[PDB]
């Protein structure tokens, strides 16, 4: 088998689930114990706001949580965590350290890789970012015609795109005095074309974000941007005023033709999907200011320390991870929904789609043996309250069990109409998890149908449609306000949740070998699309699709 | 038990799956039969472009498809379809017709509800929309200070938001000469506040989109917009130049203060999640022009006729539905991914997340029986190529089976760099489904590692991580260009897929009693948030979360 399934604490948990999980009813759990909320929630005081992690509306008892914590211990979570933090090469397939925690290590306590403290270099790049932010935001950095920069365009994909995008969206209220920020990522020419259409070459600065500086989408987009720029500037030396690079590849940055002083470095132990805390966050710092960027780092650092110092039984990312294991490996739930009741957080779910799914969508363990159990879930979601009108129908009355995290700030960035909108938002946030837990009983629905003037025949037929089984588990994560600090803490919390799950599954959360095949096959097809010749080199579907492309591309509509 | 599980053709299908499905291997299926693509694809000529539905990379044989079509016939799909199209009240829990097909019935063949043809009123409202669009887009319609309208703002949620949003995004290239369009939907005050911050009351036209005209988010947002407007205009008569309504509720529209001449009517047989074809599409028509809106309707009409007149074995929405049943009810796949390789289509997946999940996230059948089988899947996705860098790791190398629909236009709206970007986009579109199908055997990966110069130790360590199991099924849907017509056909195709699945499961695809419950929920909690006193009226979690809100809302950060 695999490490997890051979573990006796896991076997005990699974056997308990088989024998007892039918006895678990949320309504009954709360009725039996008025201390349930108190015993199944964590109220974290960060000194810069509180984060309440309420996991009480979950299908767990004291005994279940105990079994889960014991499993985390016997799967080596505590030791694995310490190994990450100390710079051990825990990304074992690539023989790399995993040190996004170093990027936000505000204490500056030494963290060594290959015997060398990484903190001086982390801080050197941060200082460079701060200086660049001053130059650009002040208007001192001039474009090729001597004008101040008004627009910043990040060009990158995946880990070099989603973090900065999600964070600048979430922290929009903190962007006064900052340039407008744009994100180009898709190779689809629509993306760069529609972006450039709204910009002036005189006042636009491009940030080319790429760990490797070889990613086809990013370099192609970058070259398109440069061509557009040079059409107006007509001077190759002006490129240095309008293009900067975030990379680990000094040589490839030079080949593109960017000034070496224009390069903001990061390191191989910064995974792309854990990179917003590094030089990759330059567009964040430019947009909201370096002070706010430091606050974002500080929030993450707080959560890192919480994760490092806290006994597992009251350790927020550990508990979230354990609940996920319970639902994935015992209940067999394929998915996990992230439902922020916050428009600014509209890209939060998409961010953790990558963070979670690219990390833990794995099937080979440390020993090289194939898993014989589920690993990472499919992560999805949209902001509330919109979901209530759109897919919550299925959450309430479908045939799937879907663990949901509901998230909301207590304080809104826009307290319009004396707080009326936020009052309603909060009320919906609370009511939805309550409804998911409680459902609606036949006796309740029957009285409603009776009062609505339904005939005995109509009542009889309608009744089962109006009944809600409930017993649908949720987490509620509530925080004082969505400030840069609190957002940093929240992102770090989910990073560590993902880490804990990966350790428990015995997989590598930090590689991504699954990207290779698609890239190889795309390289083969690209040159085949050019010209009129029939393509026969693939399976009949691929060939047939190419034939359709060649036949349809000249047709005038 | 339920209709589907009691059905002998379904039990035959399921038994066949049990005995034979493990022997279905895509790589080998294609090798054995050069005609596979030809036998498992539909090349539809609409006379306004082609739509190729290539379903050959699915885990199916001729026999499987035969059994599925037989099941569809046994479940009375054709009769149910005819009943929808004829105006029968197939929404049985609400006693309503289901007539989104009437909205786009370009043929004008009578469709009767309660003995009366609905087409005259459909066309009267369309004519009203056409006239209004001409007046606004020409600049003739003037605001309260005598200026032309520059911005239109749709206020609505769910079915009154997502359709027009997705379509205006998808058809952005067709919006030259139209006013800017904004969508406000969330009750979260951020949504309206940030929208209004960018607008002038003098040049903004608000569209209040609401079937009932009682939805809390929409009416609150509308009242907020009206207050903001009147703060500037200071004249109630000015509202008639700046507010229109899309509704079925004349009385409530009047009560809000909107002119009856400013009301664009629709009907109870237009489900919200099927409503973009109605008056609800006014923001589409304003943005891209009425002619393009008519083309959108015409494309849907083409697909309606395809669905109505085509034998099941060659009927695109039917085949898509049947493949879904195969994966849902035989393989047990919880989810369905929609992956359009088109930035303009960035909200397409979200739209059908609503359309599918709200329709078929049900568990009571027409007979009143609780289903003892799965119904609607969780629908999710993001546009390619970004997904390849976000979550495709899990699709390729996770532990979940995930049916994916890959979609792309042959012709791009922006053929920049002499088509270079689109060439790369197409190459990735093709490569990804090829990769998911083919995988990479241990021996193939071994040879690659050997060629790369890996030592026996390093090779053995890396090998299992480099293996792709493949056999991951996809649909490829390729179309000449994403024009208004073709988009209309594509949306209608998925509408009918959803319909067919609903009939086969014996559920009502057209009610939403879970969504209806949601609108009953927050009212109780609302007044409890006011004041400093503790709330004890709920379960301890709801109580505890309310306590946290009250304790945290005054803290300065
Ligand atoms: O930053 P690069 O080298 O251009 O790579 C861009 C993306 O492919 C990359 O971020 C990818 O999402 C993952 O490896 C992140 O963990
Ligand atoms: O359009 P209304 O009445 O304001 O309702 C707004 C939404 O609740 C409504 O569209 C909901 O998404 C579903 O019923 C659509 O099928």
PDB file of N, CA and C in Angstrom, chain B residues 159-199:
ATOM      1  N   UNK B 159     -29.352  34.892 -12.193  1.00  0.00           N
ATOM      2  CA  UNK B 159     -29.866  34.877 -13.552  1.00  0.00           C
ATOM      3  C   UNK B 159     -30.053  36.256 -14.166  1.00  0.00           C
ATOM      4  N   UNK B 160     -30.159  37.282 -13.320  1.00  0.00           N
ATOM      5  CA  UNK B 160     -30.321  38.653 -13.800  1.00  0.00           C
ATOM      6  C   UNK B 160     -28.985  39.392 -13.923  1.00  0.00           C
ATOM      7  N   UNK B 161     -27.887  38.648 -13.807  1.00  0.00           N
ATOM      8  CA  UNK B 161     -26.545  39.222 -13.848  1.00  0.00           C
ATOM      9  C   UNK B 161     -25.617  38.449 -14.784  1.00  0.00           C
ATOM     10  N   UNK B 162     -25.488  37.147 -14.552  1.00  0.00           N
ATOM     11  CA  UNK B 162     -24.365  36.391 -15.114  1.00  0.00           C
ATOM     12  C   UNK B 162     -24.417  36.189 -16.628  1.00  0.00           C
ATOM     13  N   UNK B 163     -25.612  35.983 -17.173  1.00  0.00           N
ATOM     14  CA  UNK B 163     -25.784  35.882 -18.615  1.00  0.00           C
ATOM     15  C   UNK B 163     -25.314  37.111 -19.372  1.00  0.00           C
ATOM     16  N   UNK B 164     -25.914  38.266 -19.101  1.00  0.00           N
ATOM     17  CA  UNK B 164     -25.469  39.505 -19.754  1.00  0.00           C
ATOM     18  C   UNK B 164     -23.989  39.811 -19.494  1.00  0.00           C
ATOM     19  N   UNK B 165     -23.496  39.525 -18.291  1.00  0.00           N
ATOM     20  CA  UNK B 165     -22.075  39.722 -18.003  1.00  0.00           C
ATOM     21  C   UNK B 165     -21.207  38.835 -18.900  1.00  0.00           C
ATOM     22  N   UNK B 166     -21.504  37.538 -18.922  1.00  0.00           N
ATOM     23  CA  UNK B 166     -20.694  36.591 -19.682  1.00  0.00           C
ATOM     24  C   UNK B 166     -20.723  36.933 -21.167  1.00  0.00           C
ATOM     25  N   UNK B 167     -21.907  37.270 -21.674  1.00  0.00           N
ATOM     26  CA  UNK B 167     -22.072  37.544 -23.101  1.00  0.00           C
ATOM     27  C   UNK B 167     -21.403  38.854 -23.521  1.00  0.00           C
ATOM     28  N   UNK B 168     -21.549  39.921 -22.729  1.00  0.00           N
ATOM     29  CA  UNK B 168     -20.851  41.169 -23.073  1.00  0.00           C
ATOM     30  C   UNK B 168     -19.338  40.996 -23.021  1.00  0.00           C
ATOM     31  N   UNK B 169     -18.851  40.165 -22.101  1.00  0.00           N
ATOM     32  CA  UNK B 169     -17.421  39.865 -22.051  1.00  0.00           C
ATOM     33  C   UNK B 169     -16.997  39.086 -23.290  1.00  0.00           C
ATOM     34  N   UNK B 170     -17.793  38.090 -23.667  1.00  0.00           N
ATOM     35  CA  UNK B 170     -17.449  37.211 -24.780  1.00  0.00           C
ATOM     36  C   UNK B 170     -17.502  37.942 -26.125  1.00  0.00           C
ATOM     37  N   UNK B 171     -18.380  38.938 -26.217  1.00  0.00           N
ATOM     38  CA  UNK B 171     -18.621  39.666 -27.460  1.00  0.00           C
ATOM     39  C   UNK B 171     -18.045  41.079 -27.443  1.00  0.00           C
ATOM     40  N   UNK B 172     -17.069  41.301 -26.567  1.00  0.00           N
ATOM     41  CA  UNK B 172     -16.420  42.607 -26.436  1.00  0.00           C
ATOM     42  C   UNK B 172     -15.972  43.264 -27.759  1.00  0.00           C
ATOM     43  N   UNK B 173     -15.396  42.517 -28.716  1.00  0.00           N
ATOM     44  CA  UNK B 173     -14.988  43.120 -29.998  1.00  0.00           C
ATOM     45  C   UNK B 173     -16.134  43.744 -30.795  1.00  0.00           C
ATOM     46  N   UNK B 174     -17.373  43.398 -30.450  1.00  0.00           N
ATOM     47  CA  UNK B 174     -18.550  43.872 -31.178  1.00  0.00           C
ATOM     48  C   UNK B 174     -19.184  45.101 -30.523  1.00  0.00           C
ATOM     49  N   UNK B 175     -18.474  45.679 -29.556  1.00  0.00           N
ATOM     50  CA  UNK B 175     -19.006  46.764 -28.727  1.00  0.00           C
ATOM     51  C   UNK B 175     -18.546  48.175 -29.109  1.00  0.00           C
ATOM     52  N   UNK B 176     -17.832  48.311 -30.224  1.00  0.00           N
ATOM     53  CA  UNK B 176     -17.442  49.637 -30.705  1.00  0.00           C
ATOM     54  C   UNK B 176     -18.693  50.444 -31.066  1.00  0.00           C
ATOM     55  N   UNK B 177     -18.788  51.670 -30.553  1.00  0.00           N
ATOM     56  CA  UNK B 177     -19.963  52.504 -30.767  1.00  0.00           C
ATOM     57  C   UNK B 177     -21.054  52.316 -29.725  1.00  0.00           C
ATOM     58  N   UNK B 178     -20.805  51.419 -28.775  1.00  0.00           N
ATOM     59  CA  UNK B 178     -21.719  51.207 -27.672  1.00  0.00           C
ATOM     60  C   UNK B 178     -21.200  51.868 -26.410  1.00  0.00           C
ATOM     61  N   UNK B 179     -22.094  52.135 -25.461  1.00  0.00           N
ATOM     62  CA  UNK B 179     -21.691  52.679 -24.161  1.00  0.00           C
ATOM     63  C   UNK B 179     -20.930  51.633 -23.355  1.00  0.00           C
ATOM     64  N   UNK B 180     -20.083  52.090 -22.440  1.00  0.00           N
ATOM     65  CA  UNK B 180     -19.422  51.201 -21.491  1.00  0.00           C
ATOM     66  C   UNK B 180     -20.485  50.501 -20.664  1.00  0.00           C
ATOM     67  N   UNK B 181     -20.258  49.230 -20.350  1.00  0.00           N
ATOM     68  CA  UNK B 181     -21.203  48.464 -19.543  1.00  0.00           C
ATOM     69  C   UNK B 181     -20.580  48.019 -18.219  1.00  0.00           C
ATOM     70  N   UNK B 182     -21.359  48.162 -17.153  1.00  0.00           N
ATOM     71  CA  UNK B 182     -20.950  47.778 -15.811  1.00  0.00           C
ATOM     72  C   UNK B 182     -21.975  46.819 -15.248  1.00  0.00           C
ATOM     73  N   UNK B 183     -21.514  45.896 -14.411  1.00  0.00           N
ATOM     74  CA  UNK B 183     -22.403  44.957 -13.744  1.00  0.00           C
ATOM     75  C   UNK B 183     -22.229  45.059 -12.242  1.00  0.00           C
ATOM     76  N   UNK B 184     -23.325  45.369 -11.558  1.00  0.00           N
ATOM     77  CA  UNK B 184     -23.358  45.417 -10.099  1.00  0.00           C
ATOM     78  C   UNK B 184     -24.315  44.322  -9.658  1.00  0.00           C
ATOM     79  N   UNK B 185     -23.872  43.466  -8.743  1.00  0.00           N
ATOM     80  CA  UNK B 185     -24.665  42.298  -8.369  1.00  0.00           C
ATOM     81  C   UNK B 185     -24.624  41.977  -6.883  1.00  0.00           C
ATOM     82  N   UNK B 186     -23.423  41.897  -6.323  1.00  0.00           N
ATOM     83  CA  UNK B 186     -23.274  41.568  -4.912  1.00  0.00           C
ATOM     84  C   UNK B 186     -23.936  42.628  -4.040  1.00  0.00           C
ATOM     85  N   UNK B 187     -24.542  42.208  -2.930  1.00  0.00           N
ATOM     86  CA  UNK B 187     -24.962  43.177  -1.915  1.00  0.00           C
ATOM     87  C   UNK B 187     -23.754  43.856  -1.267  1.00  0.00           C
ATOM     88  N   UNK B 188     -22.627  43.149  -1.194  1.00  0.00           N
ATOM     89  CA  UNK B 188     -21.395  43.735  -0.681  1.00  0.00           C
ATOM     90  C   UNK B 188     -21.223  45.140  -1.251  1.00  0.00           C
ATOM     91  N   UNK B 189     -21.207  46.131  -0.358  1.00  0.00           N
ATOM     92  CA  UNK B 189     -21.195  47.536  -0.740  1.00  0.00           C
ATOM     93  C   UNK B 189     -20.029  47.948  -1.617  1.00  0.00           C
ATOM     94  N   UNK B 190     -18.952  47.173  -1.565  1.00  0.00           N
ATOM     95  CA  UNK B 190     -17.822  47.376  -2.456  1.00  0.00           C
ATOM     96  C   UNK B 190     -18.259  47.414  -3.916  1.00  0.00           C
ATOM     97  N   UNK B 191     -19.208  46.554  -4.273  1.00  0.00           N
ATOM     98  CA  UNK B 191     -19.596  46.422  -5.668  1.00  0.00           C
ATOM     99  C   UNK B 191     -20.196  47.709  -6.226  1.00  0.00           C
ATOM    100  N   UNK B 192     -21.257  48.207  -5.596  1.00  0.00           N
ATOM    101  CA  UNK B 192     -21.853  49.459  -6.053  1.00  0.00           C
ATOM    102  C   UNK B 192     -20.939  50.668  -5.809  1.00  0.00           C
ATOM    103  N   UNK B 193     -20.258  50.699  -4.663  1.00  0.00           N
ATOM    104  CA  UNK B 193     -19.427  51.849  -4.300  1.00  0.00           C
ATOM    105  C   UNK B 193     -18.311  52.108  -5.307  1.00  0.00           C
ATOM    106  N   UNK B 194     -17.599  51.058  -5.699  1.00  0.00           N
ATOM    107  CA  UNK B 194     -16.499  51.227  -6.642  1.00  0.00           C
ATOM    108  C   UNK B 194     -16.980  51.522  -8.059  1.00  0.00           C
ATOM    109  N   UNK B 195     -18.172  51.039  -8.393  1.00  0.00           N
ATOM    110  CA  UNK B 195     -18.796  51.355  -9.671  1.00  0.00           C
ATOM    111  C   UNK B 195     -19.197  52.832  -9.735  1.00  0.00           C
ATOM    112  N   UNK B 196     -19.947  53.291  -8.734  1.00  0.00           N
ATOM    113  CA  UNK B 196     -20.413  54.680  -8.691  1.00  0.00           C
ATOM    114  C   UNK B 196     -19.267  55.693  -8.633  1.00  0.00           C
ATOM    115  N   UNK B 197     -18.142  55.299  -8.035  1.00  0.00           N
ATOM    116  CA  UNK B 197     -16.962  56.165  -7.938  1.00  0.00           C
ATOM    117  C   UNK B 197     -16.394  56.545  -9.303  1.00  0.00           C
ATOM    118  N   UNK B 198     -16.661  55.712 -10.306  1.00  0.00           N
ATOM    119  CA  UNK B 198     -16.161  55.923 -11.661  1.00  0.00           C
ATOM    120  C   UNK B 198     -17.183  56.565 -12.600  1.00  0.00           C
ATOM    121  N   UNK B 199     -18.331  56.974 -12.062  1.00  0.00           N
ATOM    122  CA  UNK B 199     -19.444  57.426 -12.896  1.00  0.00           C
ATOM    123  C   UNK B 199     -19.917  58.840 -12.579  1.00  0.00           C
TER     124      UNK B 199
END
